[PDB]
Every structure is written in structure tokens, then in C-alpha cells.
Amino acid sequence: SILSLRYENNHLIDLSRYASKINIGSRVNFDPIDKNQIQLFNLESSKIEVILKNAIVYNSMYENFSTSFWIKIPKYFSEISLNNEYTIINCIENNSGWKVSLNYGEIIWTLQDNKQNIQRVVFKYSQMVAISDYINRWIFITITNNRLTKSKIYINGRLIDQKPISNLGNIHASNKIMFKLDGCRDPRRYIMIKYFNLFDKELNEKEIKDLYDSQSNSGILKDFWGNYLQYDKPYYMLNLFDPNKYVDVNNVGIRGYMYLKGSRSTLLTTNIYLNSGLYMGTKFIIKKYASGNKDNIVRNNDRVYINVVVNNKEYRLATNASQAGVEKILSALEIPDIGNLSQVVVMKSKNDQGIRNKCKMNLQDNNGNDIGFIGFHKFNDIYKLVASNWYNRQIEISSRTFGCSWEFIPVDDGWGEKP
Ligand SMILES: [Cl-]
Questions:
Q1: How far does residue 351's CA lie from ligand 1's centre (Å)?
Q2: Which of 18, 353, 326 is nearest to 177 (CA)?
Q3: How far is the CA of 21 from the centre of ligand 1 (A)?
Q4: CB–CB of 385/260 below 8 Å?
Q5: Domains along the chain with CATH numbers
Q6: Structural element, H or E, at residue 118
Q7: Residue 394: which of 365, 368, 373 has the closest Cα?
Q8: Distance 137 CA to ligand 1 centre (A)
Q9: CA atoms of 183 and 87, how far apart (whole Å)
Q10: How far is the centre of ligand 1, averaged over its atoms, from the C-alpha of 322 (Å)?
């Protein structure tokens, strides 16, 4: 790349061979979990300016170029965000160049030539959706530009929009890239952004997929928002196969069980959003099995215990694998009475090919034999949580199955639901 903006040591740096200078304002926040996760507020002092080396300033009718980054965009909460396009990444000087801008439910790429001809490619996402892949979740952006053909915008490696640009003439962009919310009327607006890159070519579909995969951190489990999953952090649970239900407990102890039951609440602000509630049901807390590692990030193949919170008390997710049948119904046990019940969970973030997939939880007995992935099964018209090796086998012979994929949802200020 010709620009690779990364946090190292105690500063943002360009890791490219150009080592372009970076000026940060006083109100830029870096997430302590991973300081590559940059937070920009709607404040004049919340800005990053890259001073491009002269050699890489864009001034051409013919040179191809691309950009990639990940972004997490908080839910739009009120009418003040309608019909308010605001720049976030600015490389326009003297009315020519490129920029990334946001609006209500949009990510916009703009090219402007030196006669002020414009082309825009746009990603549109709805806030009128039960459970969104995009609202307040880290998503991978890629924009490519071939001066003889098309601009293209990709989301998570998938082509979303393309437009011809061969009618544009000379584009003379800024020698500065300004990361800053410019013209945003929502005082509480922020963005989170990571892994910004600029490339002096049109990336192809394979390069885009490979960049998406390589930047996915796939040896690390992720929460619903795309942040690293953590130990000792309460999470509300979502089963991806039956997303309108939430987890509940039918009594503590081995003679009770955990189950999925309908129906998520409705969150609404008239004409702004209409979503399923996410802060529902029995919270789970992931506990370390292994001694000796201070780190609170949950990694692929980590062994864990799962604690369940019921009326502000913790219990242990567990089962007696001796019960009849392949599907082992899970219970919330008193921790002092866990005895030799099966409770160790292997956490999984990636497939046999090292590609990220949704969180799976493989229950093992105390000898480390698989009891199976945690999902659910219907007994007596109730969707009880289970561990079942049937899931493991289906994955092993198909590489795909349904019911044993989960999301962990912590409270996040980009979502705004009241718990
Ligand atoms: Cl504990």
C-alpha cells in the first residue's frame, strides 16, 4: 500500500515506505482493547490529518487507486440526522479530489474532477430491520477506482454499487487526508474507524476478499458489534438460527434447563429506527479455564466456563452427558454443586480453513471428549438449549449447520437501547 495508518508504540504511524506524517487532535480516542480502533467525535479537536508525501498526491486523468478501512457507525437516533450528509474522510482541495461521507443509512464515495464533475457510489442500509448486519457493527469498506471503467464500493468483500467514471477528467486531490466529522448536525455523533489503507491500483475481487480475511483478526472471537470478545464481561445472547427468541432459565439446578423463548421487544423512534431489542434474557459471562494468562481477550480454541446470571446471581452452564439421547439439555447449576458435570467449553471463531465464522461453543466432558456444539432442540414445544455432537458431525461432513451459531451482545453506546 502507499498509506497504512496503524497505531504503534504511542502514536498513529504510516507503515508504508512513505512514512507520511500524521497530526492528531487532542480529542481522538483509541480503544484500550486495541488502539487501532480510533474514535472520532463531532468536535473540531477530534481529527487526524495525514500529510501525504508529494510522490503519492493524486493528480491524474488515468491512475487507478483504491482505499480500504473498517468502520463502526452508531445507530442514527433522531430526525436531526435525516438529510445531513457529513464528510468523514476528506481529500478534496480546490474543488477536486475524493472523499468518504456518511448520511442517515448511507456510506458515500465521491470523486470530483477539476471541472467539478462528480460521480458517487453509495452503500445504503436500513434502520427498519429486526437485526442489522451493519448498524453500529464493524464493517469492512473497500472502494476501487479504474479511470477507464468504474468506481466500485464493497462491504465485507461483497460488491454493493458500481458506476462508470470514464467521463471524469483530471482529478487533483489534496496532499492532506482529513479524518474528521465535517458538517454533522448531531452533536453526539461519533465514528469508529480502523486499518485505513490507500492503494495505487484497482484492487481485484480476490485481493479484496484476501484483505477482508487478513484484517478479520480470525484467531480472536468477536462480540456482536465486532469488538474482541472478553472474559468477565456480561453478554446478552442471540441465536442466529432463531433470532427473535432470547435465553431464559426454567429454574436453577440440574432439574431445570436453559431455553430460548419468544419474543424480542421492539425499539422504535418513529421514522428513524425500528429494531428488535438486543438487551434481553439471561446474561452470560465467559470465565477463564486456563491458568496463567493475564490477557482478557477470548481466543480461538480457548477453554472457558460459561456463567449464567439469574436475578443478579451467577450459576454455571452445565449438563450430565449420561442423560439419554444425543442432545444433552443444559442447566444453570449452583457453582458449589457442579461436581463432575460437563461444563468446559471450547470457544471457536474460525473454520477448518482459517476463515472467521460466527461464535461456536463446543462442550467437553472432564476427560476433554466432545459432548458437542451448544445449540437448541425442541422438546415438548420448548426450544431447550443443548449440546449435541450431531452439530459437530454435520459441520465435519458438510462444513455448514444451523442452530449452534451465537452472538454475544454487550451494552454499547452506539446502540442506545435501555437495558
Ligand atoms: Cl466463577
A1: 29
A2: 18
A3: 48
A4: yes
A5: 3-214 (2.60.120.200), 236-409 (2.80.10.50)
A6: strand 118-124
A7: 373
A8: 30
A9: 7
A10: 24
Residue 302 Cα, ligand 1 centroid: separation in angstroms?
Answer: 16
* CA 219 – ligand 1 centroid, Å: 25
Ligand 1 centroid to 287 CA: how many Å?
A: 7
C-alpha of residue 267 to centroid of ligand 1, in Å: 33
Distance between Cα 361 and ligand 1 center (Å): 18
Cβ atoms of 221 and 407 within 8 Å: the answer is no
The CA 307 to ligand 1 mean position distance, Å, reads 7
Burial of 17 (0-12, 13-18, 19+ CB in 10 A): exposed
Question: Residue 385 corresponds to which cell in the numbers above?
Answer: 438449549
Is the Cβ–Cβ distance between 88 and 70 less than 8 Å?
no
3-state secondary structure of 391: helix
CA of 283 to the centre of ligand 1 (A): 14
For residue 314, the CA-to-ligand 1 centroid distance in Å is: 7
Closest CA to 254 of 336, 337, 310, 371: 337
CA pair distance 171, 108, nearest whole angstrom: 18
Residue 355 neighbours by CB under 8 Å, 6+ apart: 213, 216, 218
Here the cell at position 165 is 467514471
Give resolution, Å, one decimal: 1.4
Cα–Cα distance for residue pair 37/220, rounded to 1 Å = 15
Written as nine digits, the cell of 5 is 495508518
3-state DSSP assignment of residue 211? helix
